[PDB]
Design a protein around this nucleic acid. Structure first.
Ligand SMILES: [Mg+2]
Ligand SMILES: [Mg+2]
Ligand SMILES: [Mg+2]
Ligand SMILES: [Mg+2]
Ligand SMILES: [Mg+2]
Ligand SMILES: [Mg+2]
Ligand SMILES: [Mg+2]
Ligand SMILES: [Mg+2]
Length: 117
RNA sequence: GCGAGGGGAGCCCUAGCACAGGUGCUGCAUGGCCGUCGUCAGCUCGUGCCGUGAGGUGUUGGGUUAAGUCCCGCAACGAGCGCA
């Protein structure tokens, strides 16, 4: 039961601050705000979830990234509640593209994890 | 070797020979050691990112220190010669 739970308080967002390539997903500009098409979210939802379903059961990994302040914390809840990785404070340059190197910092962390206890 | 002592074994001489010797020149052929900017807060590298490219970013910015000293930020994340 997704559906009207979306209308819940989760439809529409910003205004005249838009990217016009996002025009297809918009239902209207009621009250000078861009109300995003409720139901197209649903059509995008299943397709997405289906990719996650597949990815999940294949034992793969999602990386959760929310550094904007309202998401900061609700990201680290759900990611831990999924045993998945998350990036929370700052996205660093090349966490992915220079992974090997940024990894060496994980490597260092648990050398110091190893000198507290 | 001879029972009557001649054969360049050390050693020492003179006569030749290979050589020694040169604080003669070139610090603009050099090593090394030194002076010097300056004990000044700097100079870089790896990988990533940006640029057709030289290169850039990091090392800019805000605060702070004697200090590229530390801090906060940040397409950078770290490191090395320095600083201490
Ligand atoms: Mg950062
Ligand atoms: Mg000279
Ligand atoms: Mg010299
Ligand atoms: Mg001279
Ligand atoms: Mg290129
Ligand atoms: Mg330092
Ligand atoms: Mg300074
Ligand atoms: Mg010192």
């Amino acid at each position: 039961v997704k559906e009207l739970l979306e209308a819940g308080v989760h439809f529409g967002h910003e205004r005249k601050r838009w990217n016009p390539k996002f025009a297809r997903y918009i239902y209207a500009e009621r009250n000078g705000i861009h109300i995003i098409d409720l139901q197209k979210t649903m059509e995008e939802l299943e397709r997405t979830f289906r990719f996650i379903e597949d990815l999940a059961m294949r034992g793969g990994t999602i990386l959760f990234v929310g550094t904007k302040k309202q998401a900061q914390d609700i990201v680290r809840m759900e990611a831990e509640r999924a045993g998945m990785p998350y990036v929370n404070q700052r996205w660093l340059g090349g966490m992915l593209t220079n992974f090997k190197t940024i990894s060496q910092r994980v490597h260092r962390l648990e050398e110091l994890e190893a000198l507290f206890a």
